[PDB]
Design a protein around this ligand. Sequence first.
Ligand code: HEM
Ligand SMILES: CCCCCC[C@](O)(Cn1ccnc1)c1ccc(Cl)cc1Cl
Length: 405
Amino acid sequence: NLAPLPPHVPEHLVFDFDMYNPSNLSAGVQEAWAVLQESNVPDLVWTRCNGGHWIATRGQLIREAYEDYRHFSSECPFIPREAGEAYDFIPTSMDPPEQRQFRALANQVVGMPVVDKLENRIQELACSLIESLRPQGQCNFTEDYAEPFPIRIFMLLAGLPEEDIPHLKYLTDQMTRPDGSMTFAEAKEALYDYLIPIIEQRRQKPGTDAISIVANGQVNGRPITSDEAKRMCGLLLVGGLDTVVNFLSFSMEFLAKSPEHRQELIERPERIPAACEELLRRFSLVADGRILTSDYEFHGVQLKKGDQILLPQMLSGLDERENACPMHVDFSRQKVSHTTFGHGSHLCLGQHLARREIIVTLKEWLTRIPDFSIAPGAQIQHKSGIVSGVQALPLVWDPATTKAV
Ligand code: HEM
Ligand SMILES: CCCCCC[C@](O)(Cn1ccnc1)c1ccc(Cl)cc1Cl
């Protein structure tokens, strides 16, 4: 379903990429998107899919656009437009200077000092989860670890009941990898129906949880509104539930297929951090965008006010001009260049948490289960969207090769 080309789009700049169902999805999601970086593709293309929008294909353009909030506004960050339109998450749907006050608050909740405080639980849960899987010689990494691990830590931070997971997770999935079962606004409202009562509760009777801190915070010397707390918490929920969850699956799928990379980490643990950066570059998984505030000429292409542009954070680090042999995983790269956590004023506040969760997982999994593989005859399926995912990850191992701690 292609939309008619607007008058201003040169036909030579058309490249019909469907961010929700790219073409060689079979090969892998990162590989499917990387088609955009072939020699045949211009730097800046127009797709008629998902209602028509621009796509910046190169790290340099992605970064510039990200830096430039004057022209490229976060007002409508999602494609298709209805979704970008229905989303009013804070601080994501705002531009500086306004953004800064809200960010400062969100940072209170997810920041460095919080991860530091939470470190023992992260370690505790990882170890417990892994130890529990170990003797089985088989899981569903996606349902068995990648989900519960980050999720339960989030629930703990937010002080929300684990009983809510399935319901929340569904709503979250609808948002980043829409299915057709809902609509963007409908999904948004259901999450909002959830959040409202809880927030109200925490304004009256505060806790020490993230929601209590957000519901009761100060922004530009005055107290946040209920609507504003609702809107921040909505973001926090999606970040906590959807991201880390998908990332670990790509990383695990990779490790399951590359014995040599496993070994490297086993013998030279001093590389973990470096490896974690490399995997964040290679298995980058987020793609959102911006809205043009005005007619603007960008790298010779004429952009019209109100045009949306996809600035795929995923793409930067896959760009050959940025990383030699981009598709190759090399833990000893001199410089791992990516924008996996964004760029500009919208830089991921949750990056510290996410890094801690990854590093713990690698160290702890490899410690106990050094030797594993993908289950024979399993067909791993990736899914594309605002956040990309793995459908299921069936792993197998010989319990006799594991190590209890
Ligand atoms: C591997 C994991 C993650 C990745 C790749 C990731 C990626 C991103 C990206 C690309 C952005 C910027 C979007 C834009 O510019 O429109 C963003 C922002 C954000 N992230 Fe993350 N994120 C992850 C995990 C998390 C976690 C665990 C949380 C905390 C719940 C979270 C919270 C945030 C928030 C609050 C912002 C908005 C900052 C602002 O607008 O000032 N993220 N993230
Ligand atoms: C629609 C406005 C806010 C978007 C919701 C947050 C998130 O979906 C997940 N997330 C949140 C923090 N980290 C991951 C995301 C994913 C990718 C990109 Cl590019 C932006 C956003 Cl906001």
